[PDB]
Design a protein around this ligand. Structure first.
Ligand SMILES: [Mg+2]
Ligand SMILES: [Mg+2]
Ligand SMILES: [Mg+2]
Ligand SMILES: [Mg+2]
Ligand SMILES: [Mg+2]
Ligand SMILES: [Mg+2]
Ligand SMILES: [Mg+2]
Ligand SMILES: [Mg+2]
Ligand SMILES: [Mg+2]
Ligand SMILES: [Mg+2]
Ligand SMILES: [Mg+2]
Ligand SMILES: [Mg+2]
Ligand SMILES: [Mg+2]
Ligand SMILES: [Mg+2]
Ligand SMILES: [Mg+2]
Ligand SMILES: [Mg+2]
Ligand SMILES: [Mg+2]
Ligand SMILES: [Mg+2]
Ligand SMILES: [Mg+2]
Ligand SMILES: [Mg+2]
Ligand SMILES: [Mg+2]
Lengths: 135, 177
RNA sequence: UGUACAACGGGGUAUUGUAAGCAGUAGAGUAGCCUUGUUGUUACGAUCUGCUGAGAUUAAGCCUUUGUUGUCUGAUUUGU
RNA sequence: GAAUGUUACCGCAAUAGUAAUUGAACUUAGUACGAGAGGAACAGUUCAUUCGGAUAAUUGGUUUUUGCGGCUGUCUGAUCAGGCAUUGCCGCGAAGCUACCAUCCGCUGGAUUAUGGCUGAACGCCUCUAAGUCAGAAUCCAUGCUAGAACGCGGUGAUUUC
RNA sequence: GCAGUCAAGCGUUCAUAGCGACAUUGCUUUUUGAUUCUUCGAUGUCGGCUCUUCCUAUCAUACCGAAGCAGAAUUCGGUAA
RNA sequence: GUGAACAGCCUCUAGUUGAUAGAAUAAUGUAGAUAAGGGAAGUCGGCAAAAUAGAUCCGUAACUUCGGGAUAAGGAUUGGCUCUAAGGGUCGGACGAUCAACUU
RNA sequence: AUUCAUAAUAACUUUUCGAAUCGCAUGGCCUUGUGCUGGCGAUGGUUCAUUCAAAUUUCUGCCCUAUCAACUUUCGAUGGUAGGAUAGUGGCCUACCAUGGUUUCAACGGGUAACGGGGAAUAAGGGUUCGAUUCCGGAGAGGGAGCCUGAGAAACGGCUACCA
RNA sequence: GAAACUGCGAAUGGCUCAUUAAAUCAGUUAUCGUUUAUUUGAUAGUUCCUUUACUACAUGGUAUAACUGUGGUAAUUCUAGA
C-alpha cells in the first residue's frame, strides 16, 4: 500500500484520503484535502504559500540536519588471473627484483646487438652481389 | 527478479534468481549507486556489499542513472549517453527509458560487488578472468611495468601465442608514441 | 469525601497561513543637508526578508490531565 | 399518564404489522436441436436495477465555529486594536447535520395451489380419485424483524423514626 | 366493453392447434343513453401534481398444461394481484 | 466622507433608543442564503430564482421614415505605491517676479 | 568615391592560431655520445587571395477584374535618432519622436481550371493561343511550426510538437 | 582484414507544380552592405617566467567504442549493470 504525496503541499496522503484530479493532458494531481485542492483551483502558487514543502524548500526553512550529515565509507580487495597468466606467472613476474631485470635486460640487449650488425653486413653482402651478379 | 552480479576485481560475472518479495524488497526505493548489505538478500551473500548499477524492467527498457523516479519516462537523448547510440551526426531521439529507482517492475537488477562477504560465491570468487588486451602505447607499457624513460619497451610488450597446428606463433602489438 | 464532580490552567487534536514588536548597505524612486561620498547621511516609500509553519482559535455535543481553586443532606411523597 | 402495597431490575409474548425486487455478463456452449440459417437451459461465478433499514472512516454539500486570513466605505487624532454597513463582501474552514453525490446490511424452514404422478376400486378390464398417497409456485404459515395489551403475564432486589 | 353454447367455414389435408359465419345464452357498470329518487336558505367543474389503498378481465416476473412446440422466438391455457 | 449625485453606505448637530417580556431552538412555516454532476429533462408557460451591470479604450449586423437601430453584438482594462509630462492667475519691461488649483 | 588596403600608440581577452600527427627511404658528418644532422610527401594550421557558392540589391517588364475608389498605421503603415539583433544593409525588431507612404499614368481589393523564363502552335504582314512537362530560376516533400548537426538545411529517404 | 573509433558525404541528385500577380522570373545592375567547406596560390624564429639552484619535449592526461562477460522487453537499427 503506498503513501502518495500531495502535489501542491508535499503532504503525506494515506489511502482513502483526499482526491485525485486528472487533467486534460493527463497530468495526474493529488490533493491531501480540500484546502490544497482549492488553492490549486484558484491557481495559487505553492512556492508562495508558506506552509507547503515547496515554499519551505525554496526558503531554506528547516534543513540543518542535512548540513550536519557528512562522511561514511568502506572499500576494495585483490587479484584475478588473465588467461595465459595464472596468478602464479603474475606472482613470478611481479616479484623478481631489479638486478634480475638489468641482468635479463643487458643480456638480451647485448644478444641482439649482435643480430643488428650481422644483418647490416648481410646488406652489403646482397649488394656486392647486386653490384656484381654478372652474366 | 534476476540479479546480474559482477566481481570486477576478478573480471567475473554470474546471474542469480531471487523469488521472495521479502528477500527482494531490500532493493526497493534504493537508487543506482546505493550500497546494499548482503545478508538481507540471502545467506550465501552474507557480509557481501553490492553497489547497484542499473538493469532492465520487463518490456526490457534500461534504467538510466540520474533520473530519480521509479517509473518510465521518454527523454530526448544525445551523442555521448546511456541507452542511446546515435545513427548520424547530431541525431537525437526521443526514447522510452526506465527510472534509476528500483521497483518490482524490473526483470533484472545489475549489481557490482564492492566488498566480499564471509563466504565464497562459486562462479564469481572461485573463478578469475584474464584482461583481454595489454598496453600498446609506449608510456602505458612504462606504467603497467614501472620503468623509467631508460628501460626500453620492445621486450616489455605483451606476446600472445597462437597455433597454426604444428606451427605455433607469437604476436605482439605495435608500440605507439 | 471519591479511581468524586466542577471552574480554570496545562498537554494532545484541529483550523487558518506566518501575529504584535523590533531589525535590515531588501525596496521603484523623489526631495533636503552637508565634512561631497573605496558603504555620506536626512525625510518619505506600497512592499520584501528575519526572528516566524508563526500568531489567533480549538467543545460550545474533540481527547486527555500528578497542577490551581471550589463544591458535597434544599423540597415533596410513598406501606402489603 | 391517575388507579391496583411501594419502588427497582431482568424477562415472557397474545394481538397487530412485516419485504424485498427485477436484469445482465462469465461459464455451461457455439453445445442440445437443426440441411442450413441459426441456437437454449439447469448447477457454478461476478455484477447490476427498483425497493428498504441504518450509518458518517472516507469524498462531497452546508457555515453565526462570525474559527483564521484577505477586501471596500466610514467612524475611534495616528499606531495597535476595534465599531457600523439587518450575517458588509471574498478564500479557506473544524464540528454537527447530511447524498445512489457517500458507505454498510437486507434470514431459512414447513405446508400447499395449478400440474405431473403412485397405489386403486367403482366396472374381474381400464382409470392420478372414489378411500389412501408422492412431487410441487413470486402463494400461505412459521423462523426472522418492529411495537408490546397503558384493565395480558413471569422471575428478581430493596422495602421508612423522625 | 367483456365471456360463452351450436359448429357451417378458415386453417395444403384436418370443424374446434389457433380461429369461427348464421344464429343464440349471458356478464360488467371506468362508454353513452334512458329515468328524475336525493341535494337549488348550496355537496366547490376538467386536467395535472402528490399519496395511500382496493379490484382482476394478468402486461412483466414464479411454477405449470397446449400447439400447425425440432432449436430459438411465439402463441392458447391454468394456479397467481 | 465616499461617489456622477438631494443614491446607497458610515459620521457631526439635534432627536430617539417607543412599539409585552423570559426560557428553549421539534415539525410545518414566513423572510434571508448556499449547493457536487447535469442544465429547463420541471412547468400551460423559465413562473421563481440565477446570470449581466459602474468607468476607460477598442469594436459594433440586418433594416430604416436616414432621425435611428446602438450600451447592438463582441472584447481588453480597473488596487496600492513611487515617479514623469501637460494643462492657469496677477504684477514689473522672448524672458523676469509672485500667487494658486485640481485634473489628464 | 571611403574613416580603403596597410601601419603606429595605450590597453583589453573564462585568449584564437603558432604541428605532442602519418607514410616511404636510410644518408651524411666527428670531440664516436646510436651525437648532431638529413631526402622525397601526407594530413593538418592562422590570416590573405582565388575558385565553387550564397544572401541581399538598382533599373524596366506580368493574365482577367470598377457588379473593387480610395488604400496603408489591431498589433509598423512612411521617415528621423539610438540601441538590439543579423554573416551583414534595412522598421528586421525595440524604445523615443514625427505624420508620413500608394492611388484614374487604376492604387487597394477580388479572380486565376497562374509557378516564371528558354520556348510551342498557327506561316502574306500586323497578330492570336499556349508553355504541368528533357535546359535555367523558384518552391515543396500529407498540413503548420520549431530546431539539432554543419561550410552550407529552417533539411523531411534528420529530429521535436501539434493537426489529419 | 570483420567490427568499431575517427574523418568526409548524406545541403548534390531525382521528383512534383501545391502555393506564389510586383511575388517569382528575365534582361540589366550593386556589395564603399556580407557569409563562404572545398580547389588553387601565398602566409607563422616571438607561446614559459620575478628571469641562478627550473618548466616531461627523448614527446605530458584519462575515458570509451568495438570486444569479453552478466541481463531486460510480445515487439524496432531499444539497450542497462559490470
Ligand atoms: Mg600514432
Ligand atoms: Mg603516435
Ligand atoms: Mg644513420
Ligand atoms: Mg589544407
Ligand atoms: Mg530608424
Ligand atoms: Mg542589420
Ligand atoms: Mg496618420
Ligand atoms: Mg494621405
Ligand atoms: Mg482599368
Ligand atoms: Mg497552381
Ligand atoms: Mg514551365
Ligand atoms: Mg503562363
Ligand atoms: Mg498545374
Ligand atoms: Mg538572381
Ligand atoms: Mg501525398
Ligand atoms: Mg522541413
Ligand atoms: Mg520518400
Ligand atoms: Mg532529400
Ligand atoms: Mg489544419
Ligand atoms: Mg563517420
Ligand atoms: Mg573523464
Amino acid at each position: 500500500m503506498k503513501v502518495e504525496i500531495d502535489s501542491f503541499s508535499g503532504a503525506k496522503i494515506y489511502p482513502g484520503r483526499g482526491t485525485l484530479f486528472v487533467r486534460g493532458d493527463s497530468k495526474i494531481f493529488r490533493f491531501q484535502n480540500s484546502k490544497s485542492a482549492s488553492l490549486f483551483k484558484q491557481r495559487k502558487n505553492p512556492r508562495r504559500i508558506a506552509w507547503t514543502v515547496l515554499f519551505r524548500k525554496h526558503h531554506k526553512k528547516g534543513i540543518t540536519e542535512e548540513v550536519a550529515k557528512k562522511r561514511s565509507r568502506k572499500t576494495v580487495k585483490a587479484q584475478r588471473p588473465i588467461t595465459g597468466a595464472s596468478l602464479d606467472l603474475i606472482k613470478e613476474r611481479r616479484s623478481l627484483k631489479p638486478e634480475v631485470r638489468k641482468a635479463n635486460r643487458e643480456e638480451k640487449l647485448k644478444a641482439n646487438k649482435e643480430k643488428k650488425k650481422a644483418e647490416k653486413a648481410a646488406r652489403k653482402a646482397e649488394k656486392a652481389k647486386s653490384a656484381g651478379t654478372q652474366s | 527478479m534476476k540479479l546480474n552480479i559482477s566481481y570486477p576485481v576478478n573480471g567475473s560475472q554470474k546471474t542469480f534468481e531471487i523469488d521472495d518479495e521479502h528477500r527482494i524488497r531490500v532493493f526497493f526505493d534504493k537508487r543506482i549507486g546505493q550500497e546494499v548489505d548482503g545478508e538481507a538478500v540471502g545467506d550465501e551473500f552474507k557480509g557481501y556489499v553490492f553497489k547497484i548499477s542499473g538493469g532492465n524492467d520487463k518490456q526490457g527498457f534500461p534504467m538510466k542513472q540520474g533520473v530519480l523516479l521509479p517509473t518510465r519516462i521518454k527523454l530526448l537523448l544525445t551523442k555521448n549517453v546511456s541507452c542511446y547510440r546515435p545513427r548520424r551526426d547530431g541525431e537525437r531521439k526521443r526514447k522510452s527509458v526506465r527510472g534509476a529507482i528500483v521497483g518490482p517492475d524490473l526483470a533484472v537488477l545489475a549489481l557490482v560487488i564492492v566488498k566480499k562477504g564471509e563466504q565464497e560465491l562459486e562462479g564469481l570468487t572461485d573463478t578469475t578472468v584474464p584482461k583481454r588486451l595489454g598496453p600498446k602505447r609506449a608510456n602505458n607499457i612504462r606504467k603497467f611495468f614501472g620503468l623509467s624513460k631508460e628501460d626500453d619497451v620492445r621486450d616489455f610488450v605483451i606476446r600472445r601465442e597462437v597455433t597454426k597446428g604444428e606451427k605455433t606463433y607469437t604476436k605482439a602489438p605495435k608500440i605507439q608514441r
